């Protein structure tokens, strides 16, 4: 703004910019996961699709946060997007564990920003997160956990066979 | 879980299990109310329908709570369902008063769990209740109060005639 | 009633109330089974769906029994619903065995009530059970037995893999 | 009520009546703005439409607040509606500045009532405001600010020409 | 204007502004009536709907008057809207009597303005009122009188029963 | 691969990874441009849309490059995405100049990679670029140049008025 800004603290404004960076980094990590599973020597198309769709979801979250920054009169500021933590992601099990770790770290950042906004008596911020992010993250984390249990069930013995079956029979593919 | 659980206190987990029990008990009480009004010596079909639909609503609430328990990584635990407080429910007026008492007790339990979750800095829980339960209860309680006033208006004099008219002209029936 | 009651013994009236309780307890047991399989550390969606649909079927049976109680002029009386026998249900095999045990106990109660009604020369009761319950139970018990054999075939060796395949390829899921 | 009222403080009840008055006063101010721009010596049809639609929006907000007062068992009490602050509203720029001032004052009243309700542990009130008012106000204030910037851009030089172009090319008209 | 004003006296211009105020005050009185009948301790939905629709009709009349003020080149001037005469409105009979009193006072103001305009040889004003207001008021007053007679017929004896029947069987409701 | 890789040099593989980084950096720069023009103190919706659509186009280019990396048996490797060169982007003219600079730098990188691939006798790479990138860049650069000329024509005198008109009459908006 400063023509529209009202009840929007500098602390929240900066934390929103940080959360945009976290969501875009998550979207980048998922881009990397997706194309790893499209390698000809990995070749699990369902897994690739699963992570490519999450890359899109996380970019959308970032964009909603940026829209909101501007609705409140804050200034979007971008930082570098750190490269993902790995160049190769292992098995579907390794990948799904890394994804759940990533999601829990995003969820904690959401929770932290909600607490700041509730502290700052910023109910628009708090409801924004409640309405568009918190349940999306709980639903995604539950789906990931369900996947992890199924993958684990499958790859106790006959790990190859189990990885193929999960990709074929649980994950969406052509 | 414990693979997905995050920011979900044992206190909230137990209170959610208790609230499931309260909703299922309410659904049972409404089952009983419904079939009481289907007796050939009571025979108020609109009233029966009204309570049978509330039995379904309260079971749905319980099921949403149980879904949520699992989304958060808590463990659903069931207790006995206590039989309803009465075997015979009197007149439509008596029944509607009992229903409003029941609803207010469910609403207070919701309010209590919201307070616990807000105390515990559990905004997913608080929003879950706000989004799916609190306004449903306020709307139902208002409808019940509107009914009670109409029933009372009718059964001051000519109590039989008034009970019949309310069932015929206010409540949904075939 | 007592304006409509005809050829409807106190013994049958009480046994019908007991059978309503048994069906509602079975529906509760299936609720518990269903949500157990929705746990993130169990995560067998087909199995959850299978038991949640049986919860609905058993509640419907109870409701038909209650309708019938009132059609005959008897008085519905509700008792407590005892909590299910277990809080955690083990593997799909354990669960399906428990379900078959439960069904056989409901079937025996049906058979017992049919015998009482035939003894009491109550052909409406006997036909009611024949028409709406006995073949439903035989068909369900046969489906359960078919499932049990398939589960057993699968989990002799590679128990995880087999549990996943059964849920994926036999049970209805999204 | 007092048959339905639960967890609804006298402080909130009175503040809701005050907020109804503020919304209806805002709707009146917008009525005046609208018809000012319909004057033959002002004659900016888009601007008239813009303010007449806001008059309707603010009346709708008041009506939702009054519905809610009754849902909670409070008593609606009306006060006079003070005449708008001006009889003539100047240029589109003057008018849009006055509108943003008005909106910010409504938003602050919303924020104030949210704080009271959160203080009073009234989560239905707080969610009611979050769900139906706070983001509507943030979205409207942002649209007004976007308009103000465009109007300002236009009327630096050639103020007549710029006022006409904004009305023609930004605002909805026939 | 003063570019368009022709044959439009200052006396008529001021009386039109006064009549706008009277119509908006009537619309406010009807808002209050409407929400009174939506109270849970009043609870006559047809009556609420009846008065809420009249609130809309009276606002529309005010808006047509304001449009006309501007068509003729007069200047709309707004005054405060006085709060309604009562905070609680009694029975349907009391309310309908108050409404007929209100309508007759609006009708007299219309008649008075018609006389002024005919005196001033302002046939556009006179026809405007004839075409859009006078018969609308006569039709509404007749409907109110028909209602009053029916309410009176009903609440001679068994006043509660009669109030319920009128709302149910005469007034439009869901 | 290395099961599928054929005629695909390490030099091309690395240059493709670099070009992915350049396209994703361009997409990030356009994200920033887009949200700058959505600021309430900038407020040029057409310009925002124009840059947000380019953010999507550049991400799509990166994704096609990554698909191709894997089709050829190379290994995608991601680096950090450097933050954009500016935090605030000035006027539409400044922004469009920065965009043309950015595009020309991407085009040169395409040309450079084409030369490498033609040097390496890698006709699949060369045709891939010819078919999916080179004419897309020439068409975009021409559109940008057409825009720049129009913006310049407009903001010689009356820079505000001209910026508004270009956004309104050239760029796609709601
Ligand atoms: C330090 C600031 C402060 O007041 N405090 C509380 C903020 N509130 C919450 O974290 C919270 C969480 C969930 C629901 C609520 O309604 C709620 O207030 C701090 O953290
Ligand atoms: C004891 C725990 C605590 O902090 N305290 C406050 C919890 N907050 C609320 O009850 C409440 C109610 C409605 C809206 C809110 O935003 C809100 O924080 C306790 O009860
Ligand atoms: C004790 C009461 C009595 O008479 N006796 C027989 C009831 N009949 C049956 O059990 C039966 C079962 C299946 C078909 C029939 O037609 C039928 O009579 C007792 O159990
Ligand atoms: C004085 C009453 C009180 O407890 N205190 C806090 C009320 N809470 C908030 O204002 C608030 C704002 C935004 C989100 C929340 O969750 C929240 O509790 C007072 O103002
Ligand atoms: C004082 C002004 C004047 O001339 N006089 C008459 C106005 N005319 C009427 O009141 C009237 C009413 C109905 C139909 C007509 O055609 C008509 O002229 C005054 O009141
Ligand atoms: C150094 C490698 C080499 O041979 N040399 C030529 C590559 N060819 C081209 O750059 C080119 C450009 C456009 C169309 C062609 O058909 C074509 O060969 C080097 O740069």
Q: What's E1's DSSP letter? A: -
Angle at B119 between CA A65 and CA B137, to 5 degrees: 80
- Residue C119 near ligand 3, beta carbon < 6 Å: yes
Would you give the end-to-end CA distance of chain D in angstroms?
47
Q: Do C171 and C99 meet the contact criterion of CB atoms below 8 Å apart?
A: no
Residue B106: which CATH number?
1.20.1260.10
Q: Which two tokens stand for residue A31?
A: 């881009």
- What is the atom index within ligand 6 of the atom nearest the CA of F118? 7
| Residue B130 forms contact with D (CB below 8 Å) | yes
Q: Contact A100/B4 with Cβ under 8 angstroms? A: yes
Q: What tokens appear for A57 in the block?
A: 């979801």
| C-beta atoms of B142 and D70 within 8 A | yes
Interface D-E, measured as beta-carbon pairs within 8 A, has a size of 70
Q: Is B73 on the interface with A (CB under 8 A)?
A: yes
Q: Select from E119, E127, E130, E131 the residue to mutate for testing ligand 5; criterion: most ligand atoms less than 8 Å from CB.
A: E119
CA angle C8, C14, C16 (to 5 degrees): 80
A66 touches chain F (CB under 8 A): yes
User: Do F83 and A80 contact (CB within 8 A), yes or no?
Assistant: yes
Give the burial string for E26-65 (b: 16+ CB within 10 Å, else e).
Answer: bbbbbbbbbbbbbbbbbbbbbbbbbbbebbebbbebbbeb
Q: Which two tokens stand for residue C125?
A: 């009761």
B153–E169 CB contact, under 8 Å: no
Does D159 touch chain F if contact means CB atoms closer than 8 Å? no
Q: Which two tokens stand for residue E3?
A: 């570019």
CB distance C31–B78 less than 8 Å?
yes
CB contact under 8 A, C70 and B38: yes
DSSP letter, residue F121 = T
CB contacts, 8 Å: C163 with chain A: 153
Ligand 4, pocket residues at CB < 6 Å:
A 118, 121-123, 126; D 115, 118-119
Domain that holds residue A68: 1-174
Mutation test of the interface with chain A: which of D136, D138, D148, choosing the one with the most A Cβ atoms within 10 A? D138
User: Bridge partners of E81?
Assistant: D81
**Distance, first Cα to last Cα, chain F:** 47
- Residue by residue, what is the 3-state secondary structure of D36-103? HHCCCCCCCHHHHHHHHHHHHHHHHHHHHHHHHHHHCCCCCCCCCECCCCCCCCCCHHHHHHHHHHHH
User: Dihedral angle at the C-alpha atoms of E59, E63, E69, E75, nearest 10 degrees?
Assistant: 80
Given a contact cutoff of 8 angstroms between Cβ atoms, the answer to whether D24 and D81 are in contact is yes
Residue D11 counted as an annotated binding residue:
no
Both ends of chain A: CA-CA distance in Å?
A: 47
Q: Supply C113's token pair.
A: 């009530």
- Give me ligand 1 centre to Cα A114, in Å: 8
- State the distance from the centre of ligand 5 to the C-alpha of E136, rounded, in angstroms: 20
For chain D, say whether F161 makes contact (Cβ under 8 Å): yes
> Is ligand 2 within 6 A of the CB of residue D121?
yes
Alpha helices in chain B (DSSP H): 10-37, 45-71, 92-119, 123-129, 135-154, 159-169
Query: Which residues are within 8 A (CB) of B119 and not within 5 positions of it... i.e. 6 or more apart?
Result: none
Q: How many CA atoms lie within 13 A of D173 on its CB side?
A: 17
Helix (H) or strand (E) holding F11: helix F10-37
B10 touching chain A per CB within 8 A: no
3-state SS assignment for residue B82:
coil
Sequence-distant (6+) residues with CB within 8 A of F142 are: none
3-state secondary structure of E81: strand
Long-range contacts of E84-90 (CB under 8 A, 24+ apart): E84/D78, E84/E25, E84/E28, E84/E29, E84/E32, E84/E33, E85/E29, E86/E32, E87/D75, E87/D77, E87/D78, E87/E32, E88/E36, E89/E32, E89/E33, E89/E36, E89/E37
Cα–Cα distances (Å) from D80 to A126, E24, E87, F26, in that order, read 35, 12, 12, 58
Give DSSP secondary structure letters for A72-132: TT-------BPPPS-S---SHHHHHHHHHHHHHHHHHHHHHHHHHHHHTT-HHHHHHHIII
* Cβ within 8 Å, pair E32-D67: no
Question: Other C-beta atoms within 10 Å of C127: how many?
Answer: 12
Contacts of A8 (CB under 8 A, 6+ apart): A72, A73, A74, A122, A125
Cα dihedral: F51, F53, F57, F63 (round 10): 110
Residue C165 CA to residue A154 CA, distance in Å, equals 10
Contact C171, C49 (CB under 8 A): yes
Distance from CA of B146 to the nearest CA of D (A): 9
Ligand in closest contact with the CA of B111: 2
* Among candidates A108, A130, A141 on the partner chain, residue whose Cβ is nearest the Cβ of B123: A130
- Which of the residues A26, A37, A39, A59 would you substitute to probe the F interface, choosing the one with the greatest number of F C-beta atoms within 10 Å? A39
The sign one gets for the Cα dihedral C86, C91, C94, C96 is positive
Domain count, chain D: 1
Question: What value, to the nearest 5°, has the Cα angle with vertex A125 and ends A124 and A129?
Answer: 115
Q: With beta carbons less than 8 A apart as the criterion, state whether B78 and C32 touch.
A: yes
Spatial contact of E6 and E73, defined as CB atoms under 8 Å apart: yes
In the block, tokens 């009204």 appear at B50
Q: A and C: touch, per 3+ CB pairs < 8 A?
A: yes
Report CA torsion sign: C63, C65, C68, C69.
Answer: negative
Question: Which atom of ligand 3 is nearest to C119's Cα?
Answer: 2
Q: What is the 3-state secondary structure (H, E, C) of chain C?
A: CCCCCCCCCHHHHHHHHHHHHHHHHHHHHHHHHHHHHCCCCCCCHHHHHHHHHHHHHHHHHHHHHHHHHHHCCCCCCCCCECCCCCCCCCCHHHHHHHHHHHHHHHHHHHHHHHHHHHHCCCHHHHHHHHHHHHHHHHHHHHHHHHHHHHHHHHCCCCHHHHHHHHHHHCCCCC
Which listed ligand is nearest to E9 at the C-alpha? 5
F38: left (phi over 0), alpha (psi -120 to 50) or beta: alpha
Task: Take residue C25 and report the two structure tokens written for it.
Answer: 């307890």
Would you call C75 and B38 a contact, using CB atoms and an 8 Å cutoff?
no
SS3 assignment, position F81: strand
Q: Tell the residue number behind the tokens 């006309």, with chain if given.
A: E68
What lies within 8 Å, CB to CB, of B62 at 6+ separation is B20, B23, B24, B27
Helix (H) or strand (E) holding A63: helix A45-71
Show the tokens assigned to C112: 């017992």
Distance of CA A165 to the CA centre of its chain: 25
A148 in reach of chain B (CB within 8 A): yes
Contact F125, F113 (CB under 8 A): yes
Resolution expressed in Å:
1.7
Q: Which position has the token pair 């079956």? A: A165
B11 carries a ligand binding annotation: no
Reading the block at residue D96, the tokens are 């849009």
- Helix E10-37 × helix E45-71 angle, to 10°: 160
Q: Which of C133, C136, C4, C118 is nearest to C69 (CA)?
A: C4
What token pair was written down for B130?
A: 């706000």
Question: Cα separation of C128 and C138, whole Å?
Answer: 15
Identify the residue whose C-alpha is closest to ligand 4 atom 20.
Answer: D115
B60 labeled part of a ligand binding site: yes
Please, what's the largest Cα pairwise distance for chain F? 64
Give the whole-angstrom CA distance, residue F117 versus residue F146. 32
Q: How far apart are CA E170 and CA F170, in angstroms?
A: 59
Q: How far is A9 from chain B (nearest CA, A)?
A: 20
Which of C9, C115, C117 should be mutated for ligand 3, with most atoms under 8 A from CB? C115
HSE of D109, CA atoms in CB hemisphere, 13 A: 18
CA–CA separation, F22 and E75 (whole Å): 63
Q: d(Cα F61, Cα F103) in Å, to the nearest integer? A: 13
Separation of alpha carbons E75 and E4, rounded Å: 12
**D130 annotated to bind ligand:** no
Instruction: Decide: F69 and F15 in contact? Cβ < 8 Å.
Output: no
């Amino acid at each position: 703004s400063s023509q529209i800004r009202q009840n929007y603290s500098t602390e929240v404004e900066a934390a929103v910019n940080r959360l945009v960076n976290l969501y875009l980094r998550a979207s980048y990590t998922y881009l990397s996961l997706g194309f790893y599973f499209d390698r000809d020597d990995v070749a699990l198309e369902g897994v690739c699709h699963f992570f490519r769709e999450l890359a899109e979801e996380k970019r959308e979250g970032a964009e909603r946060l940026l829209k909101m920054q501007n609705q409140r009169g804050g200034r979007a500021l971008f930082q570098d997007l750190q490269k993902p933590s790995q160049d190769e992601w292992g098995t579907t099990l390794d990948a799904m564990k890394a994804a759940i770790v990533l999601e829990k770290s995003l969820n904690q950042a959401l929770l932290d920003l909600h607490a700041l906004g509730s502290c700052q008596a910023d109910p628009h911020l708090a409801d924004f997160l409640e309405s568009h992010f918190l349940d999306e993250e709980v639903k995604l984390i539950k789906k990931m956990g369900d996947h992890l249990t199924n993958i684990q069930r499958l790859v106790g013995s006959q790990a190859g066979l189990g990885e193929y079956l999960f990709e074929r029979l649980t994950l969406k593919h052509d």
